[PDB]
């Protein structure tokens, strides 16, 4: 099944390649444009949003009118939420880069997070856009046998739950 995954506009801690994830940053003034530019350009399909901020925000600048559901979430950090990927210990640094075991002190574990995007996209009955995050993003591409930190302002279709479709960026 067509489903669009849209990865939220740009925020400031994107810039600083800071680790976000529920902390509720808004999106920032190129965030809005990158939302924007979204407008028109993907199929006005029924469409389903991370109930974080900088999620719900790119839905509405792309013109959609999404029900929100918090298991599009992106992961949650913890004490990790904004940790400085400079200075990320190399244990997390390297289980994210991975993208497999992995879990942020008093966060949620990768295998958590990945159970809980999976049995949402289990639930969609047809053609949908999703406003959500990268490591969402991310969950789905590498099911499928790719890979892809896809920016800020994105998108992918996917023929769930066979193979990924289009990178529009």
Same mark, same amino acid.
């Not at 067509?2 to 808004?26: F, K």
């Given at each position: 099944? %067509?489903?669009?995954?849209? &990865? #939220?506009?740009?925020?400031?801690?994107?810039?600083?390649? /800071?680790?976000?994830?529920?902390?509720?940053? =808004?999106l920032?003034? %190129? *965030?809005?444009?990158? $939302?924007?530019?979204?407008?028109?350009?993907? =199929?006005?399909?029924?469409?389903?949003?991370?109930?974080?901020? /900088?999620?719900?925000?790119?839905? %509405?600048?792309?013109?959609?009118?999404?029900?929100?559901?918090?298991?599009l /979430?992106?992961? #949650?950090?913890?004490?990790?939420?904004?940790?400085?990927?400079?200075?990320?210990?190399?244990?997390?640094?390297?289980?994210?880069?991975?993208?497999?075991?992995?879990?942020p002190?008093?966060?949620?574990?990768?295998? $958590?997070?990945? +159970?809980? @995007?999976?049995?949402?996209?289990?639930?969609?009955? !047809? =053609?949908? @856009?999703?406003?959500? #995050?990268? *490591?969402?993003? &991310? !969950?789905?591409?590498?099911?499928?046998? +790719?890979?892809?930190?896809?920016? =800020?302002?994105?998108?992918?279709?996917?023929?769930?739950?066979?193979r990924?479709?289009?990178?529009?960026?």
């Open positions: 099944m %067509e489903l669009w995954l849209v &990865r #939220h506009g740009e925020t400031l801690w994107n810039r600083e390649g /800071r680790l976000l994830g529920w902390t509720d940053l =808004p920032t003034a %190129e *965030g809005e444009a990158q $939302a924007r530019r979204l407008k028109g350009a993907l =199929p006005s399909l029924p469409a389903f949003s991370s109930d974080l901020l /900088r999620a719900r925000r790119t839905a %509405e600048l792309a013109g959609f009118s999404p029900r929100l559901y918090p298991e /979430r992106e992961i #949650h950090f913890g004490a990790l939420e904004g940790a400085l990927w400079e200075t990320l210990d190399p244990r997390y640094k390297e289980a994210l880069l991975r993208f497999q075991g992995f879990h002190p008093g966060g949620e574990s990768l295998s $958590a997070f990945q +159970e809980r @995007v999976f049995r949402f996209l289990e639930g969609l009955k !047809a =053609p949908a @856009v999703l406003f959500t #995050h990268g *490591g969402v993003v &991310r !969950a789905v591409l590498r099911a499928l046998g +790719e890979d892809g930190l896809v920016p =800020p302002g994105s998108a992918v279709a996917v023929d769930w739950p066979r990924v479709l289009v990178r529009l960026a």
